[PDB]
From Swiss-Prot:
Homodimer; cannot be ubiquitinated and does not bind DNA. Part of a FANCI-FANCD2 heterodimeric complex that binds and scans dsDNA for DNA damage. Interacts directly with FANCE and FANCI. Interacts with USP1 and MEN1. The ubiquitinated form specifically interacts with BRCA1 and BLM. Both the nonubiquitinated and the monoubiquitinated forms interact with BRCA2; this interaction is mediated by phosphorylated FANCG and the complex also includes XCCR3. The ubiquitinated form specifically interacts with MTMR15/FAN1 (via UBZ-type zinc finger), leading to recruit MTMR15/FAN1 to sites of DNA damage. It comes from Homo sapiens (Human). It is found in: Nucleus. Highly expressed in germinal center cells of the spleen, tonsil, and reactive lymph nodes, and in the proliferating basal layer of squamous epithelium of tonsil, esophagus, oropharynx, larynx and cervix. Expressed in cytotrophoblastic cells of the placenta and exocrine cells of the pancreas (at protein level). Highly expressed in testis, where expression is restricted to maturing spermatocytes. The chain holds residues 1245 to 1376 of 1451 of the full protein. It comes from the Eukaryota. The gene is FANCD2. Belongs to the Fanconi anemia protein FANCD2 family. The C-terminal 24 residues of isoform 2 are required for its function. Required for maintenance of chromosomal stability. Promotes accurate and efficient pairing of homologs during meiosis. Involved in the repair of DNA double-strand breaks, both by homologous recombination and single-strand annealing. The FANCI-FANCD2 complex binds and scans double-stranded DNA (dsDNA) for DNA damage; this complex stalls at DNA junctions between double-stranded DNA and single-stranded DNA. May participate in S phase and G2 phase checkpoint activation upon DNA damage. This is Fanconi anemia group D2 protein. The modification Phosphoserine is found at S13. Deubiquitinated by USP1 as cells enter G2/M, or once DNA repair is completed. Monoubiquitination requires the joint intervention of the FANC core complex, including FANCA, FANCB, FANCC, FANCE, FANCF, FANCG, and FANCM, and proteins involved in cell cycle checkpoints and DNA repair, including RPA1, ATR, CHEK1 and BRCA1, and is mediated by FANCL/PHF9. Monoubiquitination prevents DNA release from the FANCI-FANCD2 complex. Phosphorylated in response to various genotoxic stresses by ATM and/or ATR. In contrast, phosphorylation by ATR on other sites may be required for ubiquitination and foci formation. It is linked to Fanconi anemia complementation group D2: A disorder affecting all bone marrow elements and resulting in anemia, leukopenia and thrombopenia. It is associated with cardiac, renal and limb malformations, dermal pigmentary changes, and a predisposition to the development of malignancies. At the cellular level it is associated with hypersensitivity to DNA-damaging agents, chromosomal instability (increased chromosome breakage) and defective DNA repair.
Length: 132
């Protein structure tokens, strides 16, 4: 569902901007709730599959949400700030999940950690770039 959504333009009308940003908001909150249910279940393949598809999600967020952050930044500041404070909580959560991957030293898990890590470093440095 999240990969299908296309970035518009800065010339685009306010209605589609607001609607697609609220779609991104429910997407990131759904990602948050999907990640938060991890803490109670163990079972190696569950953490493997979520650290796998988490990565492709965060890559989607880099490639396909940030153009919308560039276009609707001047006008929808409260909305984009809501998006970013929503994303920081799942960023810290994914930091903890990668830490959980390290502490057990699971070979299947620790393969999919560094790409996820570098995408989080890229997104946080991009967020710093956007704030200035």
């Amino acid at each position: 569902t999240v990969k299908k959504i296309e970035p518009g333009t800065a010339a685009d009308s306010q209605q589609i901007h607001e609607e697609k940003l609220l779609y991104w908001n429910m997407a990131v909150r759904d990602f948050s709730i999907l990640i938060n249910l991890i803490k109670v279940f163990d079972s190696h393949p569950v953490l493997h599959v979520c650290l796998k598809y988490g990565r492709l999600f965060v890559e989607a967020f880099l490639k396909q949400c940030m153009p919308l952050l560039d276009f609707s930044f001047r006008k929808h500041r409260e909305d984009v700030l809501s998006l970013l404070e929503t994303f920081q909580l799942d960023t810290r959560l994914l930091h903890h999940l990668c830490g959980h991957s390290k502490i057990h030293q699971d070979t299947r898990l620790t393969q999919h950690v560094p790409l996820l890590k570098k995408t989080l470093e890229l997104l946080v440095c991009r967020v710093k770039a956007m704030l200035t």
